[PDB]
Design a protein around this ligand. Structure first.
Ligand SMILES: Nc1c(O)cccc1C(=O)NS(=O)(=O)NC[C@H]1O[C@@H](n2cnc3c(N)ncnc32)[C@H](O)[C@@H]1O
Length: 488
């Protein structure tokens, strides 16, 4: 069985004490300095009557102190709720309510709403970090709660094992203590665990991006300056790198694209641009962090009809596609993706919604707790998991369902289409496909292209062009912002 996060960290801190752990600006912090500040801060937090099981929110910009407060909290057994410091105060009130946070630690204590949560100044708590008060800390299990995250807000509870599994080397990545990670993902977003905890729990180094919104070249110079070897990117951020500076994507050894569907020809240009291993992967909030990886072997693997696979599970993770009954699907057979293993969350805030998504199923001589993704998926001829839909991306046309995300892939296979979103609209229901291209195309060309790969009733009525498709600051297409933008 796994250990707790502070247990793995202390074992790493005494094994690689002189290796680099954090890099901010030009300053570097070793695992020994990080362990001392974490041990001192953990005793200070206990002297504020923060005990095991308490829910403490975190609102600190990208700083060396941000990750010390994380390691400090888990040590005392608290459950942290990270919130983006760039988020508006309306969203903070929702998250603090949905998480039931009893405390809040911040570097800007005034830009927050009032409520039942106590507000503490991280600028003050660091001042009281004496080298005297040593403290004594609880014994934590792998199933003890670690942090709380949100998803579109649903409140999700993550255990220690969900992020402690990242301390295991991934065979497809070949990571070790020699590597270096770039922390650019939002802390309130589960993809930041791929960067924070795969580094601090393996002896590797974590490069801290500037706070706020650094631009693309600010990240490109940093990947080259601090020699990042493991780069986790979102769909939109990966789209920008290929368009602008694709050469910077082959400085690291592995690049992992995750979070959303992406035009397959972006992977084709990315793999041809160098010899860095490019990955498509599945990340899920309810499975704590990154969950699967598919290595795009070459441009000849990029195919039509179906998008790029998400691959095979990470260590201590199990993923399987079930059909209309609980049994694995064959090749091509479409079903829903179920996930089990050390990454599965402890549940939602609603005990009934928890039971409607977490089910214990016997599988291979063992009762295993599965989470339902509501992602329609299938397999390829090599048992690589391939996503095709998401359940709420459907609609009835001529009495029969159609897959929204499936038509989007058939449209992206057109060489002129850069990207496309499709919207279900209300008429006395039809499809509206907003496309992007750089060369004037006719909407009859896109419809004629669709008829070669789709029946006549899987073709939208309206095609419109958007100078750009909206993003969510987490790198994925915002179908919500597009609909509200189409209300013009
Ligand atoms: N990206 C993450 C990460 O790297 C680490 C940890 C967490 C996340 C995260 O995304 N958590 S989340 O916000 O709850 N979203 C979950 C939903 O995203 C969609 N999704 C995810 N990957 C892909 C992909 N390759 N192709 C197409 N669609 C994808 C599916 O529908 C899925 O069910």
């Amino acid at each position: 069985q796994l250990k707790a996060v502070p247990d793995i960290f202390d074992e790493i801190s005494q094994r690689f004490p002189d290796r680099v752990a954090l890099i901010f600006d030009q300053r570097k912090i070793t695992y020994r300095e990080l362990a001392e500040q974490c041990s001192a801060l953990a005793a200070v937090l206990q002297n504020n009557c923060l005990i095991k099981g308490d829910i403490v929110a975190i609102k600190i910009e990208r700083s060396p102190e941000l990750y010390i407060f994380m390691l400090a909290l888990m040590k005392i057994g608290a459950v942290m709720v990270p919130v983006n410091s760039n988020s508006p105060e309306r969203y903070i009130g929702e998250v603090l309510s949905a998480a039931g946070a009893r405390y809040l630690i911040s570097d800007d204590v005034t830009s927050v709403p009032g409520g039942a949560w106590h507000v503490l100044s991280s600028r003050t708590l660091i001042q009281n970090c004496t080298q005297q008060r040593s403290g004594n800390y609880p014994v934590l299990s792998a199933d003890d709660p670690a942090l709380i995250l949100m998803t579109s807000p649903k409140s999700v509870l993550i255990a220690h094992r969900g992020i402690a599994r990242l301390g295991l080397p991934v065979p497809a990545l070949g990571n070790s203590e020699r590597d270096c990670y770039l922390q650019i993902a939002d802390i309130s977003f589960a993809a930041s665990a791929n960067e924070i905890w795969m580094a601090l729990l393996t002896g590797a180094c974590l490069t801290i991006a500037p706070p706020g919104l650094p631009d693309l070249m600010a990240l490109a110079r940093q990947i080259e300056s601090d020699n990042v070897t493991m780069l986790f990117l979102s769909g939109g951020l990966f789209r920008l790198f290929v368009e602008v500076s694709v050469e910077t994507l082959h400085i690291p050894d592995c690049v992992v694209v995750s979070g959303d569907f992406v035009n397959p020809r972006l992977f084709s240009v990315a793999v041809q641009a160098g010899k860095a291993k490019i990955f498509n992967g599945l990340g899920c909030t309810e499975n704590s962090a990154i969950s699967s990886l598919y290595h795009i072997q070459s441009a000849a693997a990029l195919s039509s009809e179906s998008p790029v696979p998400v691959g095979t599970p990470l260590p201590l993770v199990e993923m399987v596609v079930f059909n209309e009954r609980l049994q694995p699907c064959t090749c091509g057979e479409y079903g829903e993706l179920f996930i089990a293993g050390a990454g599965v969350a402890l549940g939602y805030s609603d005990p009934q919604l928890t039971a409607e998504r977490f089910i214990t199923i016997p599988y291979q001589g063992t009762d295993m707790l599965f989470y339902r993704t509501d992602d329609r998926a299938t397999y390829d001829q090599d048992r690589n998991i391939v996503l095709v839909g998401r359940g709420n991306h459907i609609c009835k046309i001529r009495g029969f369902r159609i897959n929204i995300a499936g038509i989007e892939h058939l449209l992206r296979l057109h060489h002129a289409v850069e990207d496309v979103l499709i919207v279900v609209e209300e008429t006395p229901p039809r499809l509206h496909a907003c496309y992007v291209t750089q060369d004037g195309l006719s909407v009859a060309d896109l419809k004629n292209h669709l008829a070669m790969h789709a029946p006549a009733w899987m073709i939208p009525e309206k095609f419109s062009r958007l100078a750009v498709l909206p993003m969510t600051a987490n790198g994925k297409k915002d179908r919500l912002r597009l609909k509200n933008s189409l209300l013009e």
